[PDB]
Amino acid sequence: GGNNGFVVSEAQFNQMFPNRNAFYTYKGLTDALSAYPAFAKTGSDEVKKREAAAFLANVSHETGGLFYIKEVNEANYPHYCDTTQSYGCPAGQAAYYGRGPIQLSWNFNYKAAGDALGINLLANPYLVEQDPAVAWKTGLWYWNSQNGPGTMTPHNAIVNNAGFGETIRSINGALECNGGNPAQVQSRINKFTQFTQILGTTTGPNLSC
Ligand SMILES: [Cl-]
Ligand SMILES: [Cl-]
Ligand SMILES: [Cl-]
Ligand SMILES: [Cl-]
Ligand SMILES: [Cl-]
Ligand SMILES: [Cl-]
Ligand SMILES: [Cl-]
Ligand SMILES: [Cl-]
Prior knowledge:
The protein has 209 residues and is an all-alpha fold. Helices cover 47% and strands 0% of the residues. Helix 3 crosses helix 9 (182-199) and helix 4 packs across helix 6. The protein starts with 9 loop residues before the first helix and ends in a 10-residue tail after the last helix.
């Protein structure tokens, strides 16, 4: 029964993210895991490690290796408010820009993620850039419950072995996949591959989209 701790060691995490903002810590991440008990705990260890690498690689890509807590371009913040929604944009028109490890964006996603976590992030979206425990939960929420532009959750893509490619599709596939941005598809694949090497697992199939 022995050691069933997290498949990413603190030291591997540091190697993966040498230039992280202080907001993002190993502890913060390991604390969030219990909110998504199947994450990195489903299937063989080859698979758990694969899933951990897949998540953190995509996280790396969103944030510049966890340097950025929030989206940089203030001028474009207003666009993340989808006025066509009925609960509107109560925290402000300009309040729903990218924050945290998956750069959670859009009033509708702040709403969905908050409902899921039991936290009213529609009203207090600033929590994702102020409270690490919440930021990390928003990352796991996306990874474990959202299809995005694709057809399956990133979790299931790896767990059912449909390919790291489906994680990309489900994160930003309408713009990047199907020829849209092969360079950036490959960048994500590059970081995933390095991360699988750090953890001593394999990449598995269908890396691309
Ligand atoms: Cl740390
Ligand atoms: Cl879960
Ligand atoms: Cl990266
Ligand atoms: Cl406003
Ligand atoms: Cl916290
Ligand atoms: Cl919390
Ligand atoms: Cl693009
Ligand atoms: Cl690269």
